Design a binder for this molecule. Structure first.
Ligand SMILES: *[C@]1(O[C@@H]2[C@@H](O)[C@@H](O)O[C@H](CO)[C@H]2O)O[C@H](CO)[C@@H](O)[C@H](O[C@H]2O[C@H](CO)[C@@H](O)[C@H](O)[C@H]2O)[C@H]1O
Ligand SMILES: *[C@]1(O[C@@H]2[C@@H](O)[C@@H](O)O[C@H](CO)[C@H]2O)O[C@H](CO)[C@@H](O)[C@H](O[C@H]2O[C@H](CO)[C@@H](O)[C@H](O)[C@H]2O)[C@H]1O
Ligand SMILES: *[C@]1(O[C@@H]2[C@@H](O)[C@@H](O)O[C@H](CO)[C@H]2O)O[C@H](CO)[C@@H](O)[C@H](O[C@H]2O[C@H](CO)[C@@H](O)[C@H](O)[C@H]2O)[C@H]1O
Lengths: 729, 303, 304
């Protein structure tokens, strides 16, 4: 109440020094209930100043002057000056107007998108302020829609400057934290829009095992249910709740077989045509909803309706869950229309996520983005992207930017969904990105030609895809720990560079570069390789410090912007001196938590990593060359230590300390080996290869080696050779 | 026309000539004020070089050494001495790399790939330094010619090139710091030896004369119109030319027909970034490939 | 006027601001007391130090309580206030809608430095006479961004000299000074020649100025003012009358390097015309492409 100020028909709540709620009420009553967006307005007390006159009020915090001159809210009556100098004259908010600087957020879907699409604003701005309008309905205490707010205007002014992480934390305090994901969500998912039988689906799952590809999730797409068998008088077979008995004669037994293989099972649900008279559950639903069965009255989709929702969860989903379905893929594409004015997609995500908690702890959905606050209902499902280099090139930027509206669990169709064109290299680059994305779900539309099975491709592509898919399971400990940090501390797994480096202009100029947890920096390659080099490339910004390629140990002295080149089988991922990354030593081994962890240490600085698990916390410390591992609880877990290049300790039990000061710090990576490899794969003249190898071996002074490559007629070859020289300086 | 005259001035004979056209006169004042002034400057330079040329002439006649030598006369075992067709030695003290291609309009500069042999080299005109051995693309405005001298080079010049007199009444001794050197000025009726040994410059002649000697050590005139034989210690005198990275960088960016936003960013980043390797990494990202090469020349000279 | 400013103590006293909370005197040109404090206590001391007139450089939008554009409030009240200390005083400010010609001079602002911007500007300038706004001052040579071309700078200055106002200006770049001696000796000498010509034209300009004020005739007229029934008077966008004695066809395209000359298609009305500079004659009526070296500008005068 000390942090609440009324003036004329407005109410101002100073939630933090940098977050002010702004309300208008014609009725003099202001809204206390939660909304679709807002779950909590309880914040600790803060200091601020007021200048209140007859006709005007000014609220003053450490970061903003908010002015209200009375009357209806207009661009003239309600406005704010930030106490920052990030811009020369973009430091003022005017009610109902847009200002420059917004770093954007996300959008509902990538359905039908070939490359870039427009995004909605987020809460982050380079100029230090953003306004988030609450246009949603009020909730009841139990979380049903209650109707219109009595605050007919309800806004949140964010004035955090470039303290982006704190803005996001306080956003999560206002809108509710992201829930914890279950560990199974972080493994590889198999999905394909393909009319598998029980037999061919299990045969494929057993082929994954034979091929050494680990999976956590078995998606079954819409051909699980009747499609062509639906009489046309009912409409299409898009919506379905009845097994196709030719393909799945015993569904519970088939799901039992996936459960024996330690897979979680989800089915595609297209809800929009509801429960029509041909469906297996229709007799029960018709009885519950008092439908006219002799006129074959449909139970039309109506998620505003309590009785419909109950029948949907209990009598439609319920029997399928009893057969063993673990969680729901809500695949909604039929618009934003409802009686209530609430988006049916929001109603589905809110009510289905809540219903999923009844049968499994920390359960998920898979569904499209439903607006600010819908991060409460993971996972995000971006949908039917066009298969193209342009779509891949948009996706890292899309994924990191989404953290700016707190939606940090986007699952993209890895390799793209539909249409587009075949290029095995595009498929491989997309999988590299997916492995370093929130969720790694392989999926494809209905084409005989778009399977994401590694063995679809040639032996080189296949082996690389298998390697990356195994790496995803090696990363599950790191991902799961980051997941618990999202849930408990409001930190995104994927951060734009500018979260960590807000004052570095280069942190705003590398759209596809991101931080992946706290220990890794990713620069995916999203452009087709230069055939003369047989290598793809990306311009990488290296912050201040010593950086190592995560895979090769190639070093880079920051701060620098440097074009980096990789073969199609290799991905630019970097770790700082002192980085500690845990890996599952046994990624193929079915076990709910790893029996063995590899501690991968990057020499040259102190470091620390906290491994959060379901029932433990394990701290790895690297201080003055001493590596120490301690846990809250004891276990039989065996620890492996890799210090730079070399395995130091193999499968050691319990807590321990070891001195690595007397151990080889340097990786093997060396200029001459790397130079020989780049020249050898290049589709260039042998006389050019001979001369470059000879001259770069003979010329001793680094500045003269660089002068020699500066004369090369191949401009991209110059850049590739320059990367090696820079790493070898 | 201007590039051709630059070459002619550093060729065996500088004879302006043209066929029967009302439009092909080689008079400097045929052209605009910029071209005219540059042509006049080069034509005066030719007469400043007559002492050096005449001495080389007597060396051709008496010792069978050409004034103009291919690089491979001096550097027969260096493959790069066979790969710079238009580069040559001009007497024993100067190495010439004429520009013979129309300028890049985006840079407002012409260029030539120069092979610098082992040693420290200076632009004869600007004092811009180059560490050999290296092959390096060099850029010059249309009024400037790539001519280079080694540390220790001594070049005599006529101080009064316009003055009608059968032999110069005044010689400028132009000394390039950083090494010992020597030059023998052969004339019709004299020989004058200039020696630069452990920072001591000595001038002696076979016969005495009223000739007045001027000494330019790098940048600075040390002695003005001094008669007779003499010695002077230059160890306590400023060795360094004025030429500097920042002034040269500003000039190249300023004449360039490129975006002002690119000029602003290059000047700001190259001033801010302290480590030479990171200044080179910054220019390596430039979308203008020839601008990269021009900036790289400045960075290489400023290393 | 924020709390760090030299005039803030006086403004705070006049407007009863809370100085211990560092309350800003926010810009509010709807407010009589704010306007008075702005003219008397903010501008006033600077005028006492010798400032002759105000460059109002407003780019922060059209929002006010009253629904009056703050730019209109600034131009109306500042032009009126400028008359207090000097006779026939001016401002320099952006266009504020029909009638704002009452508050000269016009300030067109932050043009991109390009051939495209120069090529628009003569047309822009003459067309403005159609809403009576006849004193546009453009940044001569362009304001910001864009690209370097000494010939573009020289052609822009040629136009400026035959425009309502010849104000050299440039944004914050070490590389965009409009000083003639920034350029080579040929460009420098031509720029100096054109800048001296502007002062030679001041008698003609000042006389035209009094004709604008007393008879409502623009200095710069589209061709179709004089030749309303000639279709060619609507087909030469950048050609204009400059007072009553001169017709201008600026060159606004980079020269053809094979000719070492720029060009413009000129419509010559009925009559005998002379190049103002060379005396080259032209028999009207004809449309004729004319060529000039970068140092020369197409300006024409009739017999008599
Ligand atoms: C794609 O699906 C179409 C079908 O609509 C139908 O026409 O058969 C086609 C094959 O011959 C098939 O390509 O296009 C539609 C319209 O854009 C999308 O709605 C489909 O995506 C969604 O549904 C799929 C099936 O459940 C699912 O795999 C996707 O993840 C959904 O986004 C798309 O596959
Ligand atoms: C050039 O001379 C021709 C003349 O032959 C004659 O036809 O008049 C022409 C002008 O309308 C003129 O261009 O071509 C010939 C044939 O190739 C050359 O022999 C001339 O060069 C020589 O003679 C010139 C006159 O003495 C002299 O200046 C040159 O140095 C000579 O090589 C050439 O000018
Ligand atoms: C230009 O000014 C920007 C500044 O805003 C700041 O970012 O510094 C830059 C240089 O590093 C500089 O280029 O761009 C802005 C935004 O478009 C304009 O508002 C500026 O023009 C106005 O202000 C100038 C300074 O008073 C003035 O010279 C112009 O006449 C004004 O239009 C522009 O220069």
């Amino acid at each position: 109440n000390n942090n609440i100020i009324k003036f004329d028909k407005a109410r101002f709540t100073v939630l933090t020094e940098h977050l002010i709620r702004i309300e208008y009420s014609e009725t003099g009553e202001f809204e206390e209930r939660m909304t679709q967006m807002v779950q909590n307005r309880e914040f600790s007390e803060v200091n601020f100043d007021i200048i209140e006159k007859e006709e005007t009020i000014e609220i003053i915090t450490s970061t903003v002057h908010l002015y209200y001159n009375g009357g209806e809210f207009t661009n003239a009556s309600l406005f704010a000056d930030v106490k920052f100098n990030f811009s020369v004259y973009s430091n003022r908010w005017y009610f109902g107007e847009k200002s420059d600087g917004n770093l954007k957020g996300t959008t509902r879907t990538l359905d039908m998108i070939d490359g870039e699409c427009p995004l909605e604003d987020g809460i982050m701005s380079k100029n230090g302020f953003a306004v988030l309008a609450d246009k949603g309905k009020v909730l009841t205490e139990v979380g049903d829609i209650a109707g219109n707010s009595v605050s007919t205007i309800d806004l949140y002014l964010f004035a955090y400057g470039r303290d982006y992480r704190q803005a996001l934390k306080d956003f999560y305090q206002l809108t509710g934290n992201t829930p914890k994901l279950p560990r199974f969500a972080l493994g590889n998912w198999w999905s394909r829009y393909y009319d598998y039988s029980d037999k061919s689906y299990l045969a494929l799952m057993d082929k994954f095992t034979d091929k050494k590809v680990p999976l956590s999730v078995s998606v079954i797409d819409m051909d699980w249910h009747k499609v062509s068998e639906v009489p046309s008088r009912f409409g299409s077979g898009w919506t379905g709740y009845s097994w196709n008995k030719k393909l799945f004669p015993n569904p519970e037994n088939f799901i039992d077989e996936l459960h024996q293989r330690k897979l979680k099972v989800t089915l595609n649900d297209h809800p929009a045509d509801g429960i029509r008279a041909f469906e297996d559950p229709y007799p029960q639903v018709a009885q519950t909803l008092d439908l006219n069965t002799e006129l074959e009255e449909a139970a039309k989709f109506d998620f505003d309706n309590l009785k419909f929702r109950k029948a949907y969860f209990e009598e439609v989903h319920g029997p399928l869950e009893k057969e063993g379905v673990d969680f729901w893929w809500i695949d909604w594409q039929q618009g934003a229309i409802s009686k209530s004015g609430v988006d049916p997609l929001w109603l589905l995500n809110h009510y289905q996520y809540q219903n999923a908690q009844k049968k499994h702890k920390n359960n998920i959905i898979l569904s499209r983005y439903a607006g600010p606050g819908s991060h409460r209902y993971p996972l995000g499902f971006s949908g039917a992207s066009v298969i193209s280099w342009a779509s891949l090139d948009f996706q890292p930027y899309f994924t990191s930017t989404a953290s700016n509206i707190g939606y940090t669990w986007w699952s993209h169709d890895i390799g793209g969904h539909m249409q587009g064109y075949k290029d095995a290299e595009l498929s491989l680059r997309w999988l590299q990105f997916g492995v370093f994305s929130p969720i790694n779900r392989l999926h494809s539309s209905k084409s005989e030609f778009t399977s994401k099975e590694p063995w679809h491709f040639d032996a080189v592509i296949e082996q690389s895809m298998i390697d990356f898919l195994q790496l995803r399971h090696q990363l599950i400990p790191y991902l799961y720990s980051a997941n618990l940090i999202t849930a408990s501390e409001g930190r995104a797994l994927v951060e734009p560079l500018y979260y960590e480096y807000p004052m570095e202009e280069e942190a705003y100029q590398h759209r596809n570069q991101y931080l992946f947890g706290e220990q890794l920096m990713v620069a995916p390659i999203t452009e087709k390789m230069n055939s003369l080099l047989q290598m793809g490339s990306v311009e990488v910004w290296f912050p201040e410090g010593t950086w190592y390629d995560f895979f090769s140990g190639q070093p880079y002295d920051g701060k620098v912007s440097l074009k980096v080149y990789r073969e199609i089988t290799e991905m630019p991922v970097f770790a700082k001196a002192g980085a500690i990354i845990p890996l599952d030593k046994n990624p193929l081994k079915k076990e709910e938590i790893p029996s063995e962890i590899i501690w991968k240490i990057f020499p040259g600085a102190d470091g620390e990593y906290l491994l959060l698990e379901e029932d433990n916390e394990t701290k790895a410390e690297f201080v003055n060359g001493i590596f120490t591992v301690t846990s809250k609880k004891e276990s039989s877990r065996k620890h492996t230590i890799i210090y730079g290049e070399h395995e130091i300790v193999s499968a050691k039990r319990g807590e321990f300390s070891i001195d690595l000061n007397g151990k080889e710090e340097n990786f093997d990576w060396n200029f001459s080996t790397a130079l020989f490899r780049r020249l050898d794969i290049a589709e260039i003249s042998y006389e050019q290869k001979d001369e470059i190898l000879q001259q770069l071996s003979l010329i001793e002074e680094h500045e003269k080696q660089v002068a020699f490559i500066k004369t090369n007629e191949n401009q991209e070859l110059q850049n590739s050779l320059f990367e090696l020289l820079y790493s070898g300086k």
